[PDB]
Amino acid sequence: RDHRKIGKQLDLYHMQEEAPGMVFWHNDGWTIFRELEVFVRSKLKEYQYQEVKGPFMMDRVLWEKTGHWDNYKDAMFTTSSENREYCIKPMNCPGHVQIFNQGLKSYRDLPLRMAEFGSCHRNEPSGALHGLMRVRGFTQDDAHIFCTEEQIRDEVNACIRMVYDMYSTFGFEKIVVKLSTRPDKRIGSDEMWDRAEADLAVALEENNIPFEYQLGEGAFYGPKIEFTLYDCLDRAWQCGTVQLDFSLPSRLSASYVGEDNERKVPVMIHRAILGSMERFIGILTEEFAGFFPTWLAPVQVVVMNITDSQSEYVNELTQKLQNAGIRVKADLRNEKIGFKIREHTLRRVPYMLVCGDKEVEAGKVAVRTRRGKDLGSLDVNDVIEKLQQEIRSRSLQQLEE
Amino acid sequence: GRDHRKIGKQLDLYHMQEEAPGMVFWHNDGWTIFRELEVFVRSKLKEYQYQEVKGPFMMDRVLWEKTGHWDNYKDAMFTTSSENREYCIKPMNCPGHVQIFNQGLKSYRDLPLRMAEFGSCHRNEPSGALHGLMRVRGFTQDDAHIFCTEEQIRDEVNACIRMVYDMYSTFGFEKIVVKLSTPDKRIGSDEMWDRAEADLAVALEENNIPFEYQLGEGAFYGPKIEFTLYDCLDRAWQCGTVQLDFSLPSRLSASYVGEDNERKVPVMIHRAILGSMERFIGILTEEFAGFFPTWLAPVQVVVMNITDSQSEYVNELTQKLQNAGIRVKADLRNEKIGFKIREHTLRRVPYMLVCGDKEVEAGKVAVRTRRGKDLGSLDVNDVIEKLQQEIRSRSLQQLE
Ligand SMILES: C[C@@H](O)[C@H](N)C(=O)N(CCCCCn1cnc2cc(Br)c(Cl)cc2c1=O)Cc1cccc(-c2ccc3c(c2)CNC3=O)c1
Ligand SMILES: C[C@@H](O)[C@H](N)C(=O)N(CCCCCn1cnc2cc(Br)c(Cl)cc2c1=O)Cc1cccc(-c2ccc3c(c2)CNC3=O)c1
Ligand SMILES: [Zn+2]
Ligand SMILES: [Zn+2]
């Protein structure tokens, strides 16, 4: 269960010292990545998020106004052009605000949920890099919610439900939650912090979630909830975060027209559920030990013949699975069936549809799982329908009997 | 008029600001168009048997010096530093494709290798030469690199040519001008070039493509075919390029084991069809004047009521359309039908479905196009089936 080994074995990705902590995604690895994007994208639609794309770099002058510059200048990649310095974004928040500030905003437009698969870059020390876990070039399942103070509880509530919903898909039901409270050096009144910390607390209570405090461990611009998941080895991974921000909107001159017609500053909620797509793929790899659920599998089905006599049955059957939308390959090589099964089992293909003389004559197919189970000879159409159901529902488990 | 900058703001597709010169902020409706365009290309990538990869945002200046590109293009390259090492923010995806190829023992049977990528690229263009989505600093390339044998070239260039006219046809671009670039300075032998310039020439003749030679403007590393498509205003846009590279593979230690077990440096075909995804979206925005084909439209359908009596019938039809894979919104606002229909006609919504008492009673729906054509009250299921076909076929034309 090492993502760096399974990564080389299943030809998912590689990394080089010409680009430290920046992944080269091969075909099969990029297929897992994109299928994860499609999953999150379906949750963005379900939870009523917009999806945007922001530039890779912006003026240092803009990044200076955020108040992150002095603290994290050493971690930020810079580049120059025509006597102007540009930062390579390590965060998507300031870009999301620029999009928000285009056109006059109203109380009617809030809550405004702005998601992005934000390609971010951090100048992290090369010694502290490790595979897909610690990287320089990463992609966040990021979003920023612009809302009123009245709307915070409802929006954090929705973020909490979204976290547990998405984690359940991958079989993560043991979640540790930590609410980080006002730090010694903070912006805003104590009353603002009382309400904000309460808003996160009540939201967790409203979802019947037991949690604990990380005292004074909150950011200077507001308190945060952090979600830690436990894999099948009972190893703790901090992935999810819901962070309140009473600073950045004001800094970058974000405003809307209230119901009383008074120009107000929106509250910003920073939220990431998976956190780093690269790290989460890393975690899933070790979690499943290369046995990715069918919907994530780079190749979901290999249709294979015993002899040359079934070559055209395989081609017709491969075409049907293709048309059904299943990631299917044909193995028509001059090799024994045991060799074919052995090779595709090693590559962790969920299903191997074996076609012999008896399968052709009956219009059926023999299904073998990568675990080595034999489901017997089934009707071709009934099998496709079942594989479609297993993919559509993003099921963790394979076909029974 | 049909300015992509004006339409971009009107339909909330994109914005650009001085804090990021020649860099696009893709808003929700604009990012929807962008992604549908990616899905379209991916459908062609599957059809023409292309694998899809993703490369690093930046690589060491050492690698870009080995390519020979630093020499004359360093002034148009973005550079950053980390731990006393200089890195180049890539203006191209070619070197990164070779690194993926180099990882794994490549044989002659693994050729041809068709490696595609939506390559996030950056070049430091003069700020004065920037305009809209057409000339930018930060762009996205529908790029691919074909690793093939010297003999496989002509066939793999045919596929490329076929793929160009195929993809251009979808958006309704039939007027294409082609140019074969043959230079005083060059790598390798004159016999090599006599076959390389002929591989491109015969491929265009076989396909009955009239082309004009551009003697000199090719490259030292090999010749190129440039494709220029024409919009409804007869404006020229050089979008497609097919470039043969004999240098970069060898210069970046690329090799495959041949049929005779001899280590041969593979030939690299550089191909981009749309070119810049943002520029194409720019051309498309002006071509259609914001009236995007249904399959590209940010919002494809709006379902609306005449009174609060049909509100539930609307919410149900909305769900059935959403379940059918159609981008649909419901308009149950207390506004006159003429107000509603104008707003979605202004937003260039292909289809406006209106639900009156007569529509509810018959299980039907009144269909109006953004062109103002009243198609009348039709069976709900027959409409959804007709809309599905229009989207899944990527039809330029609406229901008449
Ligand atoms: C949730 C999202 O909207 C938010 N914007 C964000 O990105 N956050 C929230 C907390 C910020 C604390 C303060 N903080 C922390 N680190 C910084 C680093 C830099 Br550089 C700069 Cl300029 C600012 C900061 C900064 O404000 C950080 C965040 C959240 C989730 C995963 C990751 C994350 C995950 C994996 C990796 C990395 C980051 C870097 N290398 C990896 O391998 C980062
Ligand atoms: C087809 C694809 O695989 C190919 N590799 C490629 O990227 N090419 C073609 C090969 C010519 C090399 C000459 N050339 C031109 N400019 C450079 C700039 C830099 Br910086 C560097 Cl390092 C090298 C070069 C360089 O070799 C460049 C290419 C192809 C198609 C569209 C565009 C292109 C389209 C739109 C925009 C830009 C570029 C920049 N700003 C825009 O708005 C660029
Ligand atoms: Zn943020
Ligand atoms: Zn190239």
Coordinates of C-alpha atoms in Angstrom, one line a residue, chain A residues 43-331:
Chain A
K43 CA -21.6 17.4 -6.0
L44 CA -21.1 21.1 -7.0
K45 CA -24.3 20.9 -9.1
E46 CA -26.2 19.0 -6.2
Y47 CA -25.1 21.6 -3.6
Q48 CA -25.7 24.6 -6.0
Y49 CA -22.1 25.8 -6.6
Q50 CA -21.0 28.0 -9.6
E51 CA -17.7 26.7 -11.2
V52 CA -15.1 29.3 -12.4
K53 CA -11.5 29.4 -13.6
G54 CA -9.0 32.1 -12.4
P55 CA -5.6 33.0 -13.9
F56 CA -2.3 31.3 -12.9
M57 CA -0.6 34.7 -12.0
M58 CA -1.6 38.2 -10.8
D59 CA 0.2 41.5 -9.8
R60 CA 2.2 41.3 -6.5
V61 CA 0.5 44.7 -5.7
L62 CA -2.9 42.8 -5.5
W63 CA -1.3 40.0 -3.4
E64 CA 0.2 42.7 -1.1
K65 CA -3.4 44.0 -0.3
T66 CA -4.5 40.4 0.9
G67 CA -2.1 40.6 3.9
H68 CA -0.6 37.1 3.2
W69 CA 2.5 38.6 1.5
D70 CA 4.8 39.4 4.6
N71 CA 3.9 36.0 6.3
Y72 CA 4.3 33.7 3.3
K73 CA 6.4 35.7 0.7
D74 CA 9.1 32.9 1.0
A75 CA 6.6 30.2 -0.1
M76 CA 5.2 32.1 -3.1
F77 CA 6.7 31.8 -6.7
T78 CA 7.2 35.2 -8.4
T79 CA 7.9 36.1 -12.0
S80 CA 8.5 39.6 -13.7
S81 CA 7.4 41.3 -16.9
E82 CA 7.9 45.0 -18.0
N83 CA 8.9 46.3 -14.6
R84 CA 5.9 44.6 -12.8
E85 CA 6.2 41.5 -10.5
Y86 CA 3.5 38.7 -10.7
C87 CA 2.9 35.9 -8.1
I88 CA 2.0 32.4 -9.2
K89 CA -1.2 31.8 -7.1
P90 CA -0.8 29.4 -4.1
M91 CA -4.6 30.1 -3.4
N92 CA -7.7 30.8 -5.5
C93 CA -9.4 33.2 -3.0
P94 CA -8.2 36.6 -4.4
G95 CA -9.2 35.5 -8.0
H96 CA -12.7 34.4 -6.8
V97 CA -13.1 38.0 -5.3
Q98 CA -12.1 39.7 -8.6
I99 CA -14.9 37.6 -10.3
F100 CA -17.3 38.6 -7.5
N101 CA -16.4 42.4 -7.9
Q102 CA -17.4 42.3 -11.7
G103 CA -21.0 43.8 -12.0
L104 CA -23.0 45.2 -9.1
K105 CA -23.9 42.5 -6.5
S106 CA -27.2 42.4 -4.5
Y107 CA -28.4 40.6 -1.3
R108 CA -30.6 38.5 -3.8
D109 CA -27.3 37.1 -5.3
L110 CA -26.2 35.8 -1.8
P111 CA -25.4 33.2 -0.8
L112 CA -22.9 33.1 -3.8
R113 CA -21.1 29.7 -3.9
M114 CA -18.0 29.9 -6.3
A115 CA -16.1 26.6 -6.8
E116 CA -12.8 26.0 -8.8
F117 CA -10.4 23.1 -9.5
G118 CA -7.7 25.7 -8.7
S119 CA -4.2 24.9 -10.1
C120 CA -2.1 26.4 -7.2
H121 CA 1.8 26.5 -6.7
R122 CA 3.8 26.8 -3.4
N123 CA 7.6 27.1 -3.2
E124 CA 7.8 24.2 -0.6
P125 CA 11.3 22.9 0.5
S126 CA 12.5 20.1 -1.9
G127 CA 13.5 17.9 1.1
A128 CA 9.9 17.9 2.5
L129 CA 8.4 16.7 -0.8
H130 CA 7.0 13.1 -0.9
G131 CA 5.1 11.6 -3.9
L132 CA 1.5 12.9 -4.3
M133 CA 1.3 13.6 -0.5
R134 CA 3.6 16.7 -0.3
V135 CA 3.9 18.6 -3.7
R136 CA 4.7 22.2 -5.1
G137 CA 2.0 22.0 -7.9
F138 CA -1.4 20.9 -6.5
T139 CA -5.1 21.2 -7.4
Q140 CA -7.7 22.1 -4.7
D141 CA -11.4 21.1 -4.8
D142 CA -11.7 24.7 -3.6
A143 CA -14.7 27.0 -3.2
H144 CA -15.5 30.4 -1.6
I145 CA -19.1 31.2 -0.4
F146 CA -20.1 35.0 -0.2
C147 CA -23.0 35.4 2.3
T148 CA -24.5 37.6 5.0
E149 CA -23.8 37.0 8.8
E150 CA -27.4 35.7 9.0
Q151 CA -26.6 33.0 6.3
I152 CA -23.2 31.7 7.9
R153 CA -24.9 28.8 9.9
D154 CA -27.0 27.5 7.0
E155 CA -23.9 27.6 4.6
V156 CA -21.5 25.9 7.2
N157 CA -24.3 23.4 7.8
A158 CA -24.3 22.6 4.0
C159 CA -20.5 22.4 3.9
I160 CA -20.6 19.8 6.8
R161 CA -23.2 17.7 5.0
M162 CA -21.1 17.9 1.8
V163 CA -17.9 16.7 3.6
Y164 CA -19.5 13.5 5.2
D165 CA -21.5 12.9 1.9
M166 CA -18.3 12.9 -0.3
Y167 CA -16.2 10.9 2.3
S168 CA -18.9 8.2 2.4
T169 CA -18.5 7.5 -1.4
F170 CA -14.8 6.4 -0.8
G171 CA -15.8 4.4 2.4
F172 CA -14.6 6.9 5.0
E173 CA -17.1 6.9 7.9
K174 CA -14.6 7.6 10.9
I175 CA -14.2 11.4 10.8
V176 CA -12.6 13.4 13.7
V177 CA -13.7 17.2 13.8
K178 CA -11.7 20.1 15.4
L179 CA -13.0 23.7 15.8
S180 CA -10.0 26.1 16.1
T181 CA -10.9 29.2 18.2
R182 CA -9.7 32.9 18.4
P183 CA -5.9 33.3 18.3
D184 CA -4.0 35.8 20.6
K185 CA -3.4 38.1 17.6
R186 CA -6.8 38.4 15.7
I187 CA -8.9 41.0 13.7
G188 CA -12.4 41.9 14.7
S189 CA -14.3 42.3 18.0
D190 CA -14.6 39.5 20.7
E191 CA -18.4 39.6 20.0
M192 CA -17.8 38.9 16.3
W193 CA -15.6 35.9 17.3
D194 CA -18.2 34.7 19.9
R195 CA -20.9 34.7 17.1
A196 CA -18.5 33.2 14.5
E197 CA -17.3 30.3 16.8
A198 CA -21.0 29.8 17.8
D199 CA -22.0 29.6 14.1
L200 CA -19.5 26.8 13.4
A201 CA -20.5 25.0 16.8
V202 CA -24.3 25.2 16.2
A203 CA -23.8 24.1 12.5
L204 CA -22.0 20.9 13.8
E205 CA -24.7 20.4 16.6
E206 CA -27.4 20.8 13.9
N207 CA -25.7 17.9 12.0
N208 CA -25.4 15.8 15.3
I209 CA -21.5 15.8 14.9
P210 CA -19.5 15.4 18.1
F211 CA -16.2 17.5 17.8
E212 CA -13.4 19.0 20.1
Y213 CA -11.6 22.4 20.4
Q214 CA -8.1 23.4 19.1
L215 CA -7.8 26.4 21.5
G216 CA -6.3 29.6 20.0
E217 CA -5.3 27.6 16.8
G218 CA -7.7 29.6 14.5
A219 CA -6.5 32.0 11.7
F220 CA -6.3 35.8 12.5
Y221 CA -9.3 36.5 10.1
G222 CA -11.7 33.9 11.7
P223 CA -12.3 30.4 13.2
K224 CA -12.2 27.1 11.2
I225 CA -13.6 23.5 11.3
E226 CA -11.0 20.8 10.2
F227 CA -12.1 17.3 9.2
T228 CA -9.7 14.3 9.7
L229 CA -10.6 11.0 8.0
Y230 CA -9.3 7.5 9.0
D231 CA -8.4 4.9 6.2
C232 CA -8.8 1.1 6.5
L233 CA -5.3 1.1 8.3
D234 CA -6.9 3.6 10.9
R235 CA -4.3 6.2 9.7
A236 CA -5.4 9.9 10.3
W237 CA -5.5 12.3 7.2
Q238 CA -6.5 16.0 7.6
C239 CA -8.3 16.7 4.3
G240 CA -11.5 18.8 4.9
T241 CA -11.5 22.5 6.0
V242 CA -14.3 25.1 6.4
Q243 CA -12.6 28.5 7.2
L244 CA -14.5 31.8 8.0
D245 CA -12.9 35.1 6.7
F246 CA -14.0 38.6 8.0
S247 CA -10.8 40.2 6.4
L248 CA -10.2 39.3 2.7
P249 CA -13.5 40.7 1.3
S250 CA -12.9 44.1 2.9
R251 CA -9.1 44.1 1.9
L252 CA -10.1 43.5 -1.8
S253 CA -13.1 46.0 -1.7
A254 CA -15.9 43.3 -2.0
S255 CA -19.4 44.7 -1.3
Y256 CA -23.2 44.2 -2.1
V257 CA -26.4 46.3 -1.8
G258 CA -28.4 45.1 1.3
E259 CA -32.3 45.1 1.7
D260 CA -32.0 48.6 3.4
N261 CA -29.9 49.8 0.3
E262 CA -26.8 50.1 2.6
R263 CA -23.4 49.0 1.0
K264 CA -22.3 46.0 3.2
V265 CA -19.1 43.7 3.1
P266 CA -19.9 40.0 2.5
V267 CA -18.6 37.2 4.8
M268 CA -16.4 34.7 3.0
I269 CA -16.3 31.0 3.8
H270 CA -13.2 29.1 2.5
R271 CA -14.0 25.3 2.0
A272 CA -12.1 22.3 0.6
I273 CA -13.4 18.7 1.2
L274 CA -10.8 16.5 -0.5
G275 CA -8.2 19.3 0.0
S276 CA -5.5 18.4 -2.6
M277 CA -6.8 16.2 -5.5
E278 CA -3.2 14.8 -5.8
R279 CA -2.9 13.9 -2.1
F280 CA -6.5 12.4 -2.0
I281 CA -5.7 10.2 -5.1
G282 CA -2.5 9.3 -3.1
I283 CA -4.7 8.4 -0.1
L284 CA -7.3 6.4 -2.2
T285 CA -4.4 4.5 -3.9
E286 CA -3.1 3.1 -0.5
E287 CA -6.7 2.8 0.9
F288 CA -7.8 0.4 -2.0
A289 CA -4.2 -0.8 -2.6
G290 CA -4.6 -0.3 -6.4
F291 CA -8.1 -1.9 -6.4
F292 CA -9.9 1.4 -7.4
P293 CA -13.7 1.1 -7.4
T294 CA -15.1 0.4 -10.9
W295 CA -16.2 4.0 -11.5
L296 CA -12.6 5.2 -10.8
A297 CA -10.7 2.3 -12.5
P298 CA -8.6 3.5 -15.5
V299 CA -9.8 0.4 -17.4
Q300 CA -13.1 -1.0 -16.1
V301 CA -13.5 -4.1 -18.3
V302 CA -11.1 -6.2 -20.6
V303 CA -13.1 -8.4 -23.1
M304 CA -10.9 -11.4 -24.0
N305 CA -11.3 -14.5 -26.2
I306 CA -10.0 -18.1 -25.4
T307 CA -9.1 -18.9 -29.1
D308 CA -9.1 -16.9 -32.4
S309 CA -12.6 -18.5 -33.0
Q310 CA -14.3 -15.8 -30.7
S311 CA -12.4 -12.8 -32.1
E312 CA -15.5 -11.2 -33.8
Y313 CA -17.8 -11.9 -30.8
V314 CA -15.2 -10.0 -28.6
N315 CA -15.2 -7.0 -31.1
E316 CA -19.1 -6.8 -31.1
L317 CA -19.1 -7.2 -27.3
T318 CA -16.4 -4.5 -26.8
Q319 CA -18.4 -2.1 -29.1
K320 CA -21.6 -2.6 -27.0
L321 CA -19.6 -1.8 -23.7
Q322 CA -18.0 1.2 -25.5
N323 CA -21.5 2.5 -26.5
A324 CA -22.7 1.9 -22.9
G325 CA -20.0 4.4 -21.9
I326 CA -17.8 1.8 -20.1
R327 CA -13.9 2.2 -20.3
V328 CA -13.4 -1.2 -22.1
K329 CA -10.3 -2.7 -23.9
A330 CA -10.2 -5.9 -26.1
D331 CA -7.4 -8.5 -25.4

